[PDB]
């Protein structure tokens, strides 16, 4: 199911490069140094973050723009969370710019698609266990990623994958 | 499942404020009076309505722009229908503007998420009943909101919530 | 479930009409001749194709812009594939332009919604068969449309409908 959607439009030229220090996370800063078109990168990340918080519905409840990072796998932006924002396990994101930047965020909750490595008996007591793979056990849970991560690391368990979301 | 999607882009400056009388519903007019940036509000509502009808696929079949309202809960636009447009029970909407307004509408049909208060036996004869809550009975139906509303009010039943759609 | 999303923005005026020969498929060329606003049409089709490949995630793996066509039913763009890009069976698309063109593509995999005509016994050996209609048998499969089409035409079977995707 779709949890929320967000769209954001901004004129690239009117976005200051000095905003980099306020909006970017640490891994985004490393990616920023690699970038040839610096003003576009900042504008794009601002738009993606705005679209993300629009998709949540509550906006900036107690969160900062640095709490949400957009990294890159291949050429596509990928969501990285440093806080619990909800129980969505998929963030489908897209970004385009031509003088104006337009960012799209669609948040989705899929049944399952959460991979955890650990004792079978431990997991079946707490979660609905669906399938076994090379990566680990596939479970269904509505627990937010950091809540789940803290619960599992207390035991001899490990969160392998949480949908398509990157954690920390 | 996704029923349809709609996107709309328009230059705010070229949208006349005089269009307010043609496109806005009564509750939108009350919201319009509160607004400081009047031209932006009109442009945004025009874009949202256009995106909505694009998401339907049939366009303006026999409908008017006043048949669809976009109100506000918190800071997010919320769909309010005054007519039956389909059996979607979720409208995920977003709006952004920076000289150009961009509106996004995603229509979704979720299993259930329709809350009805009334006699248990009456409902089980007609609908697949899923869960009981404080708000009422959760049912699955493909009946459009006004069709459902008219059917229930004929008996001693009441439509409490239809997904995230506002009715009337 | 949502397979991927894509957004694209481009300034219409800076898109050359000469790009028509490079980006358009044969059926799009026939539609292009009918169009009064030629520059808008090209800009829109470029934006839709870009949004489509963004939604795939891999980009232009071994594909061309001519491998993907956007035709029209009523007034809405409709996806036509000439190659296998994935197992999504729904492409929800939208296009708007006002000096800048904005295109949206949402790719979805729905359970079922693939209609095939043929021998009941042949299909039940290979696929999960769901329902019978006037158009044919509804099956669930993760086979891409051309792979499925080639498999069925080898026997006395025919692919009737693949979600809302047009094939060839």
UniProtKB/Swiss-Prot annotation, chains A, B, C:
GO terms for cellular component: cytosol. Its cofactor is Mg(2+). It is an enzyme of class 2 (transferase). It holds the Pfam family ACPS. One of its GO terms (molecular function) is holo-[acyl-carrier-protein] synthase activity. It is found in: Cytoplasm. It catalyses: apo-[ACP] + CoA = holo-[ACP] + adenosine 3',5'-bisphosphate + H(+). GO terms for biological process: fatty acid biosynthetic process; lysine biosynthetic process via aminoadipic acid. The keyword rRNA-binding does not apply. Its EC number is 2.7.8.7. Mg(2+) binds at residues 8, 50. It comes from the Bacteria. InterPro entries: 4-PPantetheinyl_Trfase_dom, 4-PPantetheinyl_Trfase_dom_sf, ACPS, Ppantetheine-prot_Trfase_dom. Keywords: Cytoplasm, Fatty acid biosynthesis, Fatty acid metabolism, Lipid biosynthesis, Lipid metabolism, Magnesium, Metal-binding, Transferase. Transfers the 4'-phosphopantetheine moiety from coenzyme A to a Ser of acyl-carrier-protein. Belongs to the P-Pant transferase superfamily. AcpS family. This is Holo-[acyl-carrier-protein] synthase. The lineage of its organism: Bacteria, Thermotogati, Thermotogota, Thermotogae, Thermotogales.
């Amino acid at each position: 199911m779709i949890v929320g959607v967000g769209i954001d439009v901004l004129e690239v030229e009117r976005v200051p490069e000095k905003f980099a220090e306020r909006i970017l996370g640490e891994s985004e800063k490393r990616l920023f140094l690699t970038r040839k078109r610096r003003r576009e990168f900042i504008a794009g990340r601002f738009a993606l973050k705005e679209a993300f918080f629009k998709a949540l519905g509550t906006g900036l409840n107690g969160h900062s723009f640095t709490d949400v990072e957009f990294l890159e796998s291949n050429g596509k932006p990928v969501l990285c969370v440093h806080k619990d924002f909800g129980f969505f396990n998929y963030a489908h994101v897209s970004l385009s710019h031509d003088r104006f930047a337009v960012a799209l965020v669609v948040l989705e909750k899929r049944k399952g698609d959460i991979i955890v490595e650990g004792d079978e008996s431990f997991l079946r007591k707490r979660f609905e266990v669906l399938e076994r793979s090379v990566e680990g056990w596939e479970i269904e849970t509505s627990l937010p990623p950091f809540t789940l991560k803290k619960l599992l690391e207390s035991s001899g368990c490990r969160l392998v994958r949480y949908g398509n979301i990157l954690i920390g």
